Amino acid sequence: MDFIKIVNEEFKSGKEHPKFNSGDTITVEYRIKEGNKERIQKYRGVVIRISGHGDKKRFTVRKISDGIGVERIFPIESPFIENITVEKYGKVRRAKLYYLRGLTGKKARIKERR
Amino acid sequence: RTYSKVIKMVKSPKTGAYTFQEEMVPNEAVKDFF
C-alpha cells in the first residue's frame, strides 16, 4: 500500500522509450505549438546526465548550435516527447559528463561502443 | 458592456428609512436582483 506509487501509476503519462545512458547520442522529437499549428521539432545531442526515480527521471541533452552550446532538460514522462531515437552508443567512464562543457571540436568527441 | 449598475431602495433595519443598496450585475442577471 504505497500511496505515492498508486498516485504515480494513475497519473502515468508519456510512452516507453528505447534504453539509453549518458554518453549516447539521441534525437528527441518534441511537439511545439506555433500559435495555432502543431509542429515537430528535432533536437539531437549527447546525453550528459540522467537523474531521478523510476519513471520520474529527467535527462539533459547537449548540442552545438551555430557554435553556441545548448542544453535541454527533458522529463522522460513528458507527453510532448513524440519519439526518442538512439543514433550512436557512447563509451564513457562516469555517470555525469559535465566535462564536455569546456570542450569543443575534435577534443569533445566520444568513443563509440561498437 | 454586459455589466450594469443596479441600485434598489429598501427599508432600513435600524432606523426605518428607504435607503439604497447598489451592486454591479450582468445585463441578463438584473431580473434576480429586481
Partner: protein, 121 residues
C-alpha cells in the same frame, strides 16, 4: 539571471560586440533579468567602422541566458553564454541579422521580428 554590471554578448549585426547591463527594468529592487526581458546597456566594444559608438547607452532584449529557464511543460533550457539584442527608441531591432540561437520565450514577448534567428529553441 543578469544583473547590473553583467557583461553580455551582442548577438546581432549592429556594430556592438559586448555590452554592460546598467539597469534591469520593471520595478523597484528588481534584481534579475532573463530571456525576453528588457535592460539598459552601455556599449563596451564595437567593430571598426561601427554604426553605434562605444559608450552609447541603449536598450536591449535578453535572448540567451547561461542560467537555465523553466517552461510550464516541465522542460528547461540553458545556453553557454549570455546574449542580448540592441533596440532603438521605438523598441525595434537596431540591426538586420541575428547570430546564434534564441530562446523560444521570445515569441510571446511581442518580439516576433527576432524570427531572423537561425534557430528558435
Amino acid at each position: 539571471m543578469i544583473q547590473q554590471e553583467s557583461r553580455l554578448v551582442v548577438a546581432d549585426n549592429s556594430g556592438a560586440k559586448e555590452a554592460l547591463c546598467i539597469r534591469v527594468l520593471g520595478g523597484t529592487r528588481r534584481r534579475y533579468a532573463s530571456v525576453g526581458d528588457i535592460i539598459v546597456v552601455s556599449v563596451k566594444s564595437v567593430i571598426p567602422s561601427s554604426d553605434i559608438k562605444k559608450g552609447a547607452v541603449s536598450k536591449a532584449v535578453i535572448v540567451r541566458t547561461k542560467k537555465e529557464v523553466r517552461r510550464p511543460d516541465g522542460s528547461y533550457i540553458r545556453f553557454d553564454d549570455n546574449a542580448c539584442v540592441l533596440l532603438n527608441a521605438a523598441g525595434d531591432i537596431r540591426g538586420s541579422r541575428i547570430f546564434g540561437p534564441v530562446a523560444r520565450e521570445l515569441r510571446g514577448t511581442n518580439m516576433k521580428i527576432v524570427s531572423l534567428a537561425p534557430e528558435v529553441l
